[PDB]
């Protein structure tokens, strides 16, 4: 409905975080971003340049389909934070058993700087098929990018940096190379007293 779901895969939960070990049995976890009436539509040609234009690129993936698998996620990240682990945990569900591949492309000024792949086998669960990417360590680029942002003294300076910083996540059926889900991520700094916020949009032409 308002879910990040295509015809074959559904992302139930997504979250980036910093976990600090206070003592041998105490762990503090800070959530930077988290997912878990109807979805507003967005013209993909408005964000096209912010992502790399190439074979395998966003325009090339959208044009090959299925168009029901494309989303744009606007995140307002919680940066109020002070042993350390930086990680990403995601949960997908499918009605069919598959071997999925989730590729993440970190982009600065539209050009890809970093990329990581994960491959997940289905875990049968109550007639559903689960894919749980549990504590995928955040790359050094991101950890050093979160660090640099925190050094700027005012949030306007921080958002200014994030107007040329995006992430593209392409979850693919490994054997068939079908686009299962393709999420485009844009960021701002949260000012909310209720933690990290987000807006999900369906990408259209």
């Amino acid at each position: 409905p308002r879910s990040v779901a295509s015809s074959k895969l559904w992302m139930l939960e997504f979250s980036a975080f910093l976990e600090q070990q206070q003592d041998p049995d105490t762990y503090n976890k800070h959530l930077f971003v988290h997912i878990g009436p109807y979805l507003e539509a967005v013209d993909i040609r408005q964000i096209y340049d912010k992502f790399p234009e190439k074979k395998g690129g966003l325009k090339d993936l959208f044009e090959r389909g299925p168009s029901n698998a494309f989303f744009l996620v606007k995140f307002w990240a919680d940066l109020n934070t002070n042993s350390s682990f930086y990680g990403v945990s995601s949960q997908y569900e499918s009605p069919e058993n598959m071997i999925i591949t989730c590729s993440t492309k970190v982009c600065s000024f539209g050009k890809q700087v970093v990329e990581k792949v994960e491959t997940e086998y289905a875990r049968y669960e109550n007639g559903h098929y689960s894919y749980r990417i549990h504590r995928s360590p955040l790359c050094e680029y991101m950890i050093n990018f979160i660090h640099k942002l925190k050094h700027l003294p005012e949030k306007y300076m921080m958002n200014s940096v994030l107007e040329n910083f995006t992430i593209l996540q392409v979850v693919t059926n490994r054997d068939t190379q079908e686009t299962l889900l393709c999420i485009a991520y844009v960021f701002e700094v949260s000012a909310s007293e209720h933690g990290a916020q987000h807006h999900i949009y369906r990408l259209v032409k």
Binding site: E40, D43, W76, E163, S190, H198, H199
Partner: peptide
């Protein structure tokens, strides 16, 4: 084109 000047819903710039 500035992100605030692009053809995007008003909510894009309005945090929930």
């Amino acid at each position: 084109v500035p992100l605030r000047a692009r053809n995007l819903p008003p909510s894009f710039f309005t945090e929930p």
